[PDB]
Design a protein around this ligand. Structure first.
Ligand code: FMN
Ligand code: FMN
Lengths: 134, 134
């Protein structure tokens, strides 16, 4: 279709937070993040890169999304889950995570492309509708 | 960060619908679409590719999203808009469109990366909350 350099620059430049990570045992290590992801998190490419993405959950580690994500990556099937995340400045938001497993098949490595959005307003709208139905 | 071939395969394989298009006057022509986009629309890469993406609106051409998208692409700034779209089988859904303008700067061409999601359930939840507030 298009040359891969063009595509990489279209991704580098996307308004959508986009990352790639590589499975290592019980971890997945971020090898690629775009600018919009740096803007979403309030971190820098260097701060972010080369660790597992969970670091954004911070203290708040009892969240059902985790298990559903973990369950889903394990089975090798895409998921979409929203977790509470925290920026560098400490502020808190609902991050929707779209995670897709990709096995290399050239080798035994598996990768994941994430695509993430601050969903905080969409959630507030639901908490409200939930209480109206009560 | 990562080699561009790896990245292109992570995109090719994403569960998220991702396209790229190229500005030509009042049009933008799709030069790249991934599999998930083919699945979103119910079209095939060959059917989809090489025309302007509006073809999915079909008959339903009076939609405010259009003007906001048009206004936004013009100004050269990202937007996120949801339009009513129609698959090949005719079925209808709410498609959220995240569109990012990218100028090449090597030449005078401008491109757009879109990232699109069936948002129909999130919308139904709002129509409901809207009427509760009435
Ligand atoms: C592609 C990809 C994107 C991810 N996005 C980040 C995210 O933006 N925020 C977050 O808190 N965790 C995110 N994670 C989730 C964690 O890295 C981790 O897989 C999850 O918390 C489940 O594993 P655990 O229970 O061992 O923590 C992402 C993971 C992957 C593979
Ligand atoms: C990157 C990109 C992705 C787009 N996504 C498609 C979409 O999935 N659905 C749709 O109906 N139109 C989509 N469009 C919107 C139309 O192609 C068009 O630009 C919009 O309807 C406004 O222009 P117009 O008023 O001249 O029709 C997309 C456009 C771009 C540039």
């Amino acid at each position: 279709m298009i040359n891969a350099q063009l595509l990489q620059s279209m991704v580098d430049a996307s308004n959508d937070g986009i990352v790639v990570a590589e499975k290592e045992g019980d971890d997945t290590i971020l090898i690629y993040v775009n600018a919009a992801f740096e803007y979403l998190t309030g971190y820098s490419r260097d701060e972010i890169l080369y660790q597992d993405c969970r670091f954004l959950q911070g203290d708040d580690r009892d969240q059902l999304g985790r298990a559903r994500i973990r369950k889903a990556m394990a089975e090798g099937r895409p998921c979409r889950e929203v977790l509470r995340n925290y920026r560098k400045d400490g502020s808190a938001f609902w991050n929707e995570l779209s995670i897709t497993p990709v096995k290399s098949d050239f080798d035994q490595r598996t990768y994941f492309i994430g695509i993430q959005k601050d969903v905080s307003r969409q959630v507030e709208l639901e908490r409200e509708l939930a209480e109206l139905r009560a």
